[PDB]
Amino acid sequence: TTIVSVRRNGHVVIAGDGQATLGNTVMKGNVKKVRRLYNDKVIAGFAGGTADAFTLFELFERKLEMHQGHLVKAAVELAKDWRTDRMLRKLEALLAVADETASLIITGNGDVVQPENDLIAIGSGGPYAQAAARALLENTELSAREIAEKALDIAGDICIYTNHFHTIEELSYK
Amino acid sequence: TTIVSVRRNGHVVIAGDGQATLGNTVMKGNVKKVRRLYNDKVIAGFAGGTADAFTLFELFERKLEMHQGHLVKAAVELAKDWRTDRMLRKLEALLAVADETASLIITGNGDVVQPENDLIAIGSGGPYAQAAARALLENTELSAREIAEKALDIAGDICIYTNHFHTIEELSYK
Amino acid sequence: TTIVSVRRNGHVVIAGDGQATLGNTVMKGNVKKVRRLYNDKVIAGFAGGTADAFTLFELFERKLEMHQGHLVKAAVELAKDWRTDRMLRKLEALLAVADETASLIITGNGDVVQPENDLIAIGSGGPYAQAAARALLENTELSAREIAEKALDIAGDICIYTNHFHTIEELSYK
Amino acid sequence: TTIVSVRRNGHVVIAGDGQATLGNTVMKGNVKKVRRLYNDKVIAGFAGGTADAFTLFELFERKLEMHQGHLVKAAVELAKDWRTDRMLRKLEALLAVADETASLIITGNGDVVQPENDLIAIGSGGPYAQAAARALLENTELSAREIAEKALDIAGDICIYTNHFHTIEELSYK
Amino acid sequence: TTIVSVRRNGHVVIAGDGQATLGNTVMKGNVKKVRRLYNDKVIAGFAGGTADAFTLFELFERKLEMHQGHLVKAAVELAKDWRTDRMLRKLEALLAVADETASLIITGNGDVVQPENDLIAIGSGGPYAQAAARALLENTELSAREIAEKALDIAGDICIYTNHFHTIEELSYK
Amino acid sequence: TTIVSVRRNGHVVIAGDGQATLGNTVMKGNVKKVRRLYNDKVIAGFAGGTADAFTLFELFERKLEMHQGHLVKAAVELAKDWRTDRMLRKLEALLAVADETASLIITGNGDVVQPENDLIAIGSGGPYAQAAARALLENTELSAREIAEKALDIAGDICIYTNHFHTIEELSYK
């Protein structure tokens, strides 16, 4: 799996592949790994179990109207419940979340990272996507969506656990 | 074990073999792995304990009673508790469930999955069946029942953990 | 250890060896691995810790007068408490239980198996006993007791963890 | 360590060495591993913590007060809690206990075991003692005390974890 | 990562690099690992989650409010809960903290440590910094700030997990 | 680390080294591993985490005024809470404790050992210290303090995890 996120001029996107792998075989190819949350004002992508993601995301929303939509402040709380709480603590997942103020990773280790340019690339194929996304975002006038897509595809060619089925959610704030 | 579900021409099936293995020897040869539910409206197959089933298949039934026959939802609510309820959590298995509406898999992880063409192939022999099923479904006019059958035989021929005892459960609707 | 159970014409038996092994040495040779339960109407054998067996069996009885002596229905419940409950869940054992309606295995995995002819063979020496029991039950007019005994002895000759001390409980219902 | 209990001619003993080992070196050389209980009526030996003992040997005493000297039962009740009580459960050890009635071993597993001839040999040097004990007991008129002694010496000679410091506790009755 | 704290001529510092690594690749290159606390009186650096910090650095602040600026004690009380409070326990990190009084490290183990000369070097690059720091401090008149800096550069040159992005926090008092 | 304790003519001592090791590097060299407890009437040394030691010792004191200063009786209780209790049970440490009645080890395994002559030597370097302490205490008229020191130094020369920084607490009762 590979979740990619690029952000250029009032345009921020999140693109994932759709492969689910079991051992050495593909169990499903059209997994939806990117969805919208919080009255569509927030986009998200996730590496891992769909149900775990569903759980973690719902709670995320919960923390949003709970902090007037402030991503980070609402996000850090989630970084909390995640490591502290009994049940959640069991969940296995990597969250990529973005709105118009910033993009950022969220993990069960109570870590809330926000890469150098809101450039997020997580999942087994993450690095390869980053590598390509970096190249594109620094030698072309291409758009977030264009980079994310092109990057994700490069990731899919390199990473044995990433296919070419995509799901992209965009957010225009310009 | 191999569970194969197919759907063609207002007909949906679920087939399975009856081998239970302990180490390198066969414990039983006629395990019924495909039952029926919701007043014989909903069919299902599975891989796991004979009891785990009888507990996960009873609960499922009631969930349908709490969601007027609407498969998916009851399924959604099922996979829910199954990863939440302290007790229910230890249960390990893979429920294959199909109604005239749709058909899907459920994992202790709480995931609810609808495979490419309502084609389901879970179990160690899963992929060999998927392969044979996919072949037939794309190159012949055979019926959903004929498919799962032959797919299952192919499986038991390749899979050392799958035999040739079957248990087929159909469903007509159009 | 080896627990064997054969059932012919109104005669059902359960026979175990009596070896207890610690590492590579015999700690005890006359372990009683088969006993009667529920006003002698039910016979049982077990692979594992005697105290764990004692515990699991008592509870089994409990579930019996709790379900008018219905083996299975009362047995499946035990298959429950066993995996769900905290303490019990810790117990390590394999149960073989029979009355006049059916013979069947019970394990901590919430599994309640009932082999092809009520032919039960569990424990490290289990397969070898099954092998012999199968041969005898299909090429001779011998009785349950005769087969069980002869089988168990074959098991003891093959299996390094099964000795030749026996304990047989019989049940005649003819 | 080696605990050897023998019983011959209205005489029962329990003997033990006094070596405690940490890795490949001797920590102590005179550990008292054979005490006395129930108003000096019941003898006992053991392998484990000096405290685990003092807790499992105090409890045992009271159990006798709750079962009028009847060894076995108190023992049965002891091994009971010892595998049930949350706290008591962590205690690890092997109690050798003998009264004018009988003599038996007890394991954290809750097991109560009466070996072939009230002959007990627990501990890493256990079997070497059993061997020498069994030899003497079957080919000489030596006394129960003389047995355990010599058996113990043989043990400490073979066992790298057993020394030659003894602690013998007899009991006459006829 | 490398955290280097030094103290010379009424001047105390804490410096750190900004590399976060996941496997064999760099996730982020500018992680702020040296903040400030207690109404900008107390400086601190750290190795761990961006949140773990924000929780362990907030708590610390209040502890100071509960112990009138007296570093040590608040630190003592901090390391206390950090190994006692069920939740707080999962937090993993290494707090470097220094005030005009003294400077010390804190580990989830509850330890409060004051190194030889208020010289602190935690993190995978820790010892390479200690080495360079110790050298300079003993053979040159350079300032505490100049020390930590150069020590840090040396570190990032040796340490594959340490880079050259810095975050220095000083403190004057005399 | 090495904790040594010798006892000669109304003089009993406890000496530790002061090295703290992380992997293959020295994190701290002047660790205080020996301190006084219970109105200075009791001396102690510990192998392991300082905070864990602090915890275990405080409780020890607690058990002292709780049993009129009887070392053993108050010590055995600690041997209890240590293995039984949830939190404490997590602590990793080795306690060496002495007063004027006896010296003795205390561990999380509910073990309370009192070596042959109140000669205690615990920690990775423990044996080497014992070896030397034994030699000295049996071929010279040297004092506890002299032996403990000389022994500890020998330990430090042999044991890669023991340095030459000492901390000795003495107790004269003559």
From Swiss-Prot, chains A, B, C, D, E, F:
Question: Its catalytic activity?
Answer: ATP-dependent cleavage of peptide bonds with broad specificity
User: Per its UniProt entry, which superkingdom is the organism in?
Assistant: Bacteria
> What keywords are annotated for this sequence in UniProt?
Allosteric enzyme, Cytoplasm, Hydrolase, Metal-binding, Protease, Sodium, Stress response, Threonine protease
What CDD domains does the entry give?
protease_HslV
Q: What is the effect of changing residue 2 to S/V?
A: 80% reduced protease activity
Q: How does activity depend on temperature?
A: Optimum temperature is 55 degrees Celsius.
Active-site residue list: 1
List GO BP terms, alphabetically: cellular response to heat; protein denaturation; proteolysis; proteolysis involved in protein catabolic process; response to heat
Subcellular location(s): the record lists: Cytoplasm
Task: Please report what switches on or represses expression of this protein.
Answer: By heat shock.
Query: Subunit composition?
Result: A double ring-shaped homohexamer of HslV is capped on each side by a ring-shaped HslU homohexamer. The assembly of the HslU/HslV complex is dependent on binding of ATP.
PANTHER family named in the record: ATP-DEPENDENT PROTEASE SUBUNIT HSLV, METALLOPROTEASE TLDD
Q: State the family it belongs to.
A: Belongs to the peptidase T1B family. HslV subfamily.
For this entry, the protein name equals: ATP-dependent protease subunit HslV
Q: Which organism is it from?
A: Escherichia coli (strain K12)
